[PDB]
Design a protein around this ligand. Structure first.
Ligand SMILES: Nc1nc2c([nH]c(=O)n2[C@H]2C[C@H](O)[C@@H](COP(=O)(O)O)O2)c(=O)[nH]1
Ligand SMILES: Nc1nc2c([nH]c(=O)n2[C@H]2C[C@H](O)[C@@H](COP(=O)(O)O)O2)c(=O)[nH]1
Lengths: 195, 195
């Protein structure tokens, strides 16, 4: 019963545009709402992808591969799943494998892929696909993974034991100031609640 | 290794502002970045909270209480953890318990509270505390959960089985074509992987 009535541009930068959205609520009243959108958005399946890289070594605890990097908006360093934008004609799965190899050097196999999910529904219209990728750590291919970071992309790789993710995450945040990503934390939480 | 140089504003609204962030890469080079920030942010505290409500009845498997509501930026309906901003001087736990009762009618108890985690570090400085809250669904006090939403808040309540959260989520995303929050889904994936 609720729908977008109109969208008024407020401002716009190269990458992001700020705008005011008017919409109709159930009762029948008209309301506004300040939203954020990525200008670089085409008619695709989603904006980007987040990769959950599960490093699997025989006779070893599974590991989750995470990346650490400076985030200007945060004014500091954050711990996140490897992530990046999807290219034209590119499949979410294909983008996941590509992005994972760029940031960490690992070459994995698709495990599963989510439908498009919203990053922060109360702010932007940004969506991503969450792709679960397994990485054969015994495979010679993944022996000594070599990351090919983008020119201007400074990323550190961090593999944590899946069996103890949350606790290992706290150990870093306590070792130094550092912001864990909400999605990463949500994942680590569910690992404890499940069992 | 990397540090902020300046945060020069670009534009602003009543709730959200757009900024130009100047920083230094590890090589000493001055780079720039377009960052979004909520103007409604109180110091000494994160932007808001996300609540993970575990509904507990003796006759049923544990459920996770989610909320569906129209999100203007997404131009559609979203399924998220009950969430909201943290009032001044208020504690994340108190904000989480309040926000839960308002949107769902449930009276819960704190299980745990995460540190400040980022919502979308590549885009914004938005952070939240993920507060896990248990709900005794057998207590007569939670017999007929009667919500009390504020100004223009139209929220529908959806409790889904913990041991099959992801299956239910995917179903909803297809049928009603609405969107599931990235943090809700990440949590759902870990539950599935962990079982
Ligand atoms: N971004 C944004 N957040 C809002 C609005 N109204 C409101 O109650 N909230 C929280 C609005 O117009 N924009
Ligand atoms: N909002 C914003 N996004 C940017 C800027 N520069 C820039 O490369 N981006 C986008 C495209 C990059 O691939 C992406 C970096 O995020 P990831 O590393 O998660 O892909 O952000 C900028 O100045 N502002």
């Amino acid at each position: 019963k609720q729908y977008i009535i109109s969208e008024e541009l407020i401002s716009e930068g190269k990458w992001v545009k700020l705008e005011k959205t008017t919409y109709m609520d159930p009762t029948g009243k008209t309301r506004t709402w300040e939203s954020v959108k990525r200008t670089t958005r085409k008619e695709q399946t989603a904006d980007g992808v987040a990769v959950i890289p599960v490093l699997q070594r025989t006779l070893h605890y599974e590991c989750i591969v995470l990346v650490k990097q400076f985030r200007p908006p945060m004014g500091g360093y954050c711990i996140e799943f490897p992530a990046g934008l999807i290219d034209d004609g590119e499949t979410p799965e294909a983008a996941a494998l590509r992005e994972l190899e760029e940031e960490t050097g690992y070459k994995g196999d698709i495990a599963e892929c989510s439908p498009a999910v919203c990053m922060d529904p109360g702010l932007s219209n940004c969506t991503i696909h969450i792709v679960t990728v397994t990485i054969n750590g015994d495979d010679a291919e993944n022996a000594r993974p070599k990351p090919k970071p983008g020119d201007g992309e400074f990323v550190e790789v961090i593999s944590l034991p899946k069996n103890d993710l949350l606790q290992r995450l706290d150990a870093l945040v306590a070792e130094e100031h550092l912001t864990v990503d909400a999605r990463v934390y949500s994942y680590a939480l569910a690992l404890k609640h499940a069992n």
